[PDB]
A = this chain, B = another copy of it.
């Protein structure tokens, strides 16, 4: 059974829905600043999280560096310039999450913070929010599936 199928079964979202982001250019629609704002909001919530089991996953990471890694990845993957690879090479999401305990429960907590970040946004329309959360949700469970094999 493939990683992507495991993600689809766990998450309620398959790759086809998760990658509906690719049907139009979201970077062109939303703009770079919108991504920076989303990631900054998300990571503010992460680093303020009172649940130590989740907070402490990010303890070896600087918040500002994490914000940059995230929005540069989102920008690159959602139709914008490839800033992430210029700096860091392949996204390699399963490989890069290897050090962290990416459990089913951690996925839901990540996605809670991100939903709250999307709810706080001004410059993201409803169609875009739906497509982005399908992408995020499928991806989070893809990482869960990758975590299970390491």
| Contact surface of A with B, Cβ cutoff 8 Å | 2-4, 7, 15-16, 18-19, 22, 82, 85-96, 98, 138-139, 142, 146, 149-150
Contacts and interface: CB of A to CB of B under 8 A. Distances in A.
A113 to B, nearest CB: 21
Main secondary structure of the interface of A (DSSP, over half): helix
24 contacts: A2-B88, A3-B92, A3-B95, A4-B88, A4-B89, A15-B87, A15-B89, A16-B86, A19-B86, A22-B85, A89-B138, A90-B93, A90-B94, A90-B139, A90-B142, A91-B91, A92-B142, A93-B95, A94-B94, A94-B95, A94-B96, A95-B146, A95-B149, A98-B149
A76 to B, nearest CB: 9
Contacts of A86: 15-16, 19, 22
Nearest to A147: B95
Number of copies: 2
A88 B3 CA distance: 9
Contacts of A139: 90
Contacts of A94: 90, 92, 94-96, 98
B149 A89 contact: no
A87 to B, nearest CB: 7
Contacts of A146: 92, 95
